[PDB]
Design goal:
Chains A, B: It catalyses: (S)-dihydroorotate + fumarate = orotate + succinate. Chains A, B: Pathway: Pyrimidine metabolism; UMP biosynthesis via de novo pathway. The structure is a homodimer of 311-residue chains. The first copy, chain A, has a seven-stranded parallel beta sheet with strand order 3-15-14-9-8-7-6. Chain A is globular, with a radius of gyration of 18 Å. Helix content of chain A is 33%, strand content 19%. In chain A, helix 7 crosses helix 9. Chain A is of the alpha/beta class. The longest helix of chain A is centred in the last third of the chain and has 16 residues. Chains A and B meet through helix 5, strand 10, strand 12, helix 6 and helix 7 of A and helix 5, strand 10, strand 12, helix 6 and helix 7 of B. The complex binds flavin mononucleotide (FMN) (2 copies), orotic acid (ORO) (2 copies) and magnesium ion (2 copies). One magnesium ion (MG) binds next to helix 1 of chain B.
Amino acid sequence: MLNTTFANAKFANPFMNASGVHCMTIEDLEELKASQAGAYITKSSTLEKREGNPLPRYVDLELGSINSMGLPNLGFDYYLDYVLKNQKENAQEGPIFFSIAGMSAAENIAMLKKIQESDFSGITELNLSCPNVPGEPQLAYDFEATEKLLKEVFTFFTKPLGVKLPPYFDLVHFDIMAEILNQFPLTYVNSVNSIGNGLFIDPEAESVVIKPKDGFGGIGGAYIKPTALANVRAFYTRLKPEIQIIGTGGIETGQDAFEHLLCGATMLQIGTALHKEGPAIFDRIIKELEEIMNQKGYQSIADFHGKLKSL
Amino acid sequence: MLNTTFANAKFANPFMNASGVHCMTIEDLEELKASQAGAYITKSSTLEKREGNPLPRYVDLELGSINSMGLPNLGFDYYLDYVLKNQKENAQEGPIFFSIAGMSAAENIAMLKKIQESDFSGITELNLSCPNVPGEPQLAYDFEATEKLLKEVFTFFTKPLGVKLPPYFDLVHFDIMAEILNQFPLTYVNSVNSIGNGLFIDPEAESVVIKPKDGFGGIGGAYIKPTALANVRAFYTRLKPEIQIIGTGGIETGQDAFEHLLCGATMLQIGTALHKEGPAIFDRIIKELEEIMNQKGYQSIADFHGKLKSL
Ligand SMILES: Cc1cc2nc3c(=O)[nH]c(=O)nc-3n(C[C@H](O)[C@H](O)[C@H](O)COP(=O)(O)O)c2cc1C
Ligand SMILES: Cc1cc2nc3c(=O)[nH]c(=O)nc-3n(C[C@H](O)[C@H](O)[C@H](O)COP(=O)(O)O)c2cc1C
Ligand SMILES: O=C(O)c1cc(=O)[nH]c(=O)[nH]1
Ligand SMILES: O=C(O)c1cc(=O)[nH]c(=O)[nH]1
Ligand SMILES: [Mg+2]
Ligand SMILES: [Mg+2]
């Protein structure tokens, strides 16, 4: 029922982990491979290995989560070596996704070239929106810098590429970004990364709950579904059909997944909910979505994909 | 216990309605006056009377609300005539707040001049962030246009003035805006207006819940407290002490109020929660806040105002 075609590849279902969650080590990745997830993506990596920000840096919240991980990762070469060797065993339906989040344009270009030169036949995701690195704003909020980077990227990168975008809240920003993105042979757009620099407070102790950046961190979960759905839908009605979409944000139940698909998303990523529940979430949500489809008499995602009705 | 000094005026408590909620007519305003609210503000007005967007345009949600009112209001002259006549009876402790949201820079300048020329001795709030007007982006997201407007405003407006800002999600944006605002003799900054262009979906009917803008509307309530608290706090540590702050967003309990004050807010505005509960909310939340203060042994807001601790 959930069979999906994305980036010219076949997946058993649209579900994936969101980058940053349950994908730090080879062990995490193999666990995602063994789960019911239709596909998975690696932790955004940087050229060098990173310890990340001081703890506590992640906190579960009643309505979601707040975090300022600081991009902890085992380094580009670690992830590249992994996907390459994995690619050779052909032990899974659908390619693996490789996320990169360079500390600079030079680092991103350098990593993209290594991927281009390697035999990697999977999908690449360029993270233009990490909101938890001190003294480093979000690239995707600088429309000019974003376009400049993408133009250079496409003078050499020919492999499948998607971009992880932060949320937008003004319709003109969607128009500007869509116009920028439509000029490239992009494979997809992933909306959205966590809502940037939010704040949670323990009223009793009268203090923040995470140590870095004075408690400011990216917000995920139920808090952001309205924003995530809007971004997926807004880009769905503005991006040329060649550029598909991955919906990310506030997905916890089959109903949340249904809403994202209804907006126009093809693949779906789970962050906060996966972090709290573990890989078993995929089996649960898959069944929840199929039950919704069965009640409505739908046998394939194409029966409602992108069909959100206006009043 | 909640006595507050703001814009050189005395208020019995920091609570107010948020512009747009329970302040459309003279009758709504008198009801706010009769309530326990420490102060109140009028519905953002335009030079001409406006019917607003087609219904349904506002919907209560489990975690908040979504709306695209379209600035319905009875016109500038209506509100001005009201505050002027009320001013003469001196029937309340603390001045009234007058919100304006011109459809253009010219309309805003025109309204500010009328206020400047009139005998209005109250406080004025310039709304630079209405996210529900079709074909009209948010001014406060255009740093250049915002500064240009404010420079012209201050060549003639000498009365108390505050600005209603949309939420920011990047630390550099806070730096840019603070630098812009600090150059003016601004009375205050009100963070934040609703989270712009979010989307809510009825999964059963497979459609949006509000008619205008294909269902996209401003998000309010619990959904946005993390963002609202961050904006209040971020500006609190960047604005010169002459510019005070009004905290708005996700305030429903005395605890939410406590958090905003802890971040640096002096006055507090309630939107969504007031819309659902009615003016009686003020009596409730006031008692909830005093109970929190009593448990902690605080006798005045100054005992914890702005004292949010970092880890
Ligand atoms: C602990 C944690 C780490 C994350 N790290 C990354 C990351 O490395 N790269 C990335 O693109 N997004 C990262 N994100 C954001 C997610 O990919 C996702 O966009 C966000 O959490 C919104 O989805 P959710 O509502 O399901 O949590 C991270 C989120 C969390 C909670
Ligand atoms: C029905 C409705 C109408 C609103 N109209 C205005 C308005 O005219 N001017 C303004 O500055 N904000 C307006 N807002 C936004 C609020 O003032 C407030 O910033 C927002 O709702 C965030 O607060 P909350 O979480 O308490 O709802 C409106 C909000 C709602 C729900
Ligand atoms: O690793 C992180 O801190 C991080 C990166 C990113 O892109 N998003 C997020 O929420 N956290
Ligand atoms: O009247 C409206 O539509 C409106 C204005 C504004 O500034 N904010 C909001 O949420 N609605
Ligand atoms: Mg598997
Ligand atoms: Mg009263």
